[PDB]
Design a protein around this ligand. Structure first.
Ligand SMILES: COc1ccccc1-c1noc2nc(C)[nH]c(=O)c12
Length: 309
């Protein structure tokens, strides 16, 4: 039913508003808040959106240079277009670079979520901190934690929910991007102990359980069945599960991209098998989709057709 895509790390990517105009996209995850407070300058989080933003950064009130970008003008301009078009825009935390970020304590997990809520959530009279996207309010937060284990993330999720519940008139969302092996070293703890709305399983780069292994069963064993089972047991039991795929041949490691016809064979099986739990498709990522035109349309448009068929 829904199609989610990452944007922000594509080489020479088009600006976000280009993807705000793409009807087929339902959810866009903007990557990334990639530096975490415990190990970053000023103890502020830091951000990177590839070729976007003017390169300026915030300083702390004592003059310490942070890694949080302060001139993301096109992003600020573009998010409201996405939302006007009915898309959900989630700010993604983590991403694969750098490899050395984690959360060291319960207190800092809570403080990280508090900061992000203040900086990127609803505008509040009592916040005197940075507003990197101005008066824009994101639709929630994606946990793309790719290194260093699982500590802290459940606490962050729970903290965000407490905050969401103070704004009962607006819906916000939380998501996670585990890889396919169960247990997932970064996110099984958060999925077991806290409640995500969406979970997109990355079904590329691990041979044991990839989407490609549905097509060629000699490679591995595609394990969406196992993920349904593990979720029914978790605090995330009401999450919808998405199949995460590369949007071109070069978006991930060699051998993990599926043709539209291959995706249709997988999705038809699994959407039929799990009509309530199967949420849709997630794509890595917007620029690879856009650059992979098939019969005059980007890969993402072909994915939505499969989902609606
Ligand atoms: C290890 O793979 C990566 C290294 C650096 C930057 C991005 C990736 C990456 N490849 O597929 C991905 N998929 C997700 C959800 N997040 C990522 O960071 C990546």
């Amino acid at each position: 039913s829904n199609l989610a895509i990452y944007w922000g790390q594509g080489p020479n990517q088009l600006r976000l508003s280009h993807f705000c105009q793409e009807t087929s996209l339902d959810i866009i995850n903007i990557g990334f808040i990639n530096y975490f407070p415990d190990m970053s300058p000023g103890h502020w989080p830091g951000s990177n959106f590839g070729n976007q933003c003017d390169g300026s950064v915030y300083v702390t009130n004592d003059g310490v240079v942070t890694k949080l970008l302060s001139g993301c003008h096109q992003i600020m301009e573009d998010i409201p277009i996405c939302q006007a078009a009915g898309k959900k825009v989630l700010l993604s935390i983590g991403g694969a670079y750098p490899p050395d970020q984690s959360i060291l304590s319960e207190d800092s997990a809570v403080a990280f979520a508090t900061f992000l809520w203040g900086a990127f959530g609803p505008v509040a009279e009592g916040w005197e901190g940075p507003r990197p996207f101005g008066d824009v309010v994101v639709d929630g937060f994606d946990f793309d934690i790719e290194h260093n284990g699982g500590f802290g993330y459940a606490t962050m999720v729970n903290t965000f929910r407490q905050y969401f519940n103070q704004v009962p008139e607006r819906k916000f969302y939380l998501s996670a991007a585990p890889q396919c092996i169960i247990p997932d070293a970064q996110l099984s703890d958060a999925i077991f102990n806290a409640a995500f709305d969406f979970i997109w399983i990355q079904y590329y780069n691990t041979a044991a359980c990839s989407a490609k292994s549905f097509i060629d069963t000699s490679l591995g064993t595609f394990n969406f069945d196992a993920w349904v089972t593990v979720l029914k047991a978790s605090a995330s039991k009401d999450a919808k599960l998405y199949v995460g795929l590369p949007a071109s041949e070069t978006a991930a490691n060699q051998g993990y991209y599926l043709t539209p016809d291959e995706v249709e064979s997988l999705v038809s099986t699994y959407m039929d098998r799990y009509p309530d739990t199967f949420g849709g498709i997630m794509l890595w990522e917007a620029t690879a989709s856009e650059n992979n035109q098939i019969d005059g349309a980007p890969y993402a448009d072909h994915m939505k057709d499969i989902l609606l068929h």
